[PDB]
Amino acid sequence: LDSFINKFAEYTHEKWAFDKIQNNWSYGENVDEELKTHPMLRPYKTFSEKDKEIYRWPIKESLKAMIAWYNPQPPDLSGVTLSRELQAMAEQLAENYHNTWGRKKKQELEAKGGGTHPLLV
């Protein structure tokens, strides 16, 4: 929504960075079998533009469509369970993954030169 949204990509990385050290992916060049390292061992608060292809505007529209209608520690988010006022809204948030990306999914197989997938339901 605001400049705080840049810290949401931190959370997506804070959980994503924490398990790598937990699972031998420490640091040094990239994800690899012979190396078994963590490529992006760096906070997103002061980040480069390589994650702007995943986070930012794609995650902004994730948080902007709603208004229309190094060992980081990610905190626990399940402190408050989503009641039916919000549980059915996550039923709509999961619908976004098949609407925003699903529309691209229809435009993914129709912009390659053919192909069909049963997921289009």
Return the ∠ at Cα 56 (arms to 26 and 7), rounded to 5°.
60
Resolution in units of Å = 3.6
How were these coordinates obtained?
Answer: cryo-EM
Among 72, 73, 5, 7, CA closest to 41: 72
Q: Which long-range contacts (CB under 8 A, 24 or more apart) does 26-31 make?
A: 27/70
**CA pseudo-torsion sign 30, 75, 90, 68:** negative
DSSP of 27-39 = SSS-S-TTT---S
Contact 41, 17 (CB under 8 A): yes
Q: Tell me phi and psi for residue 81, to 5 degrees.
A: -70, 145
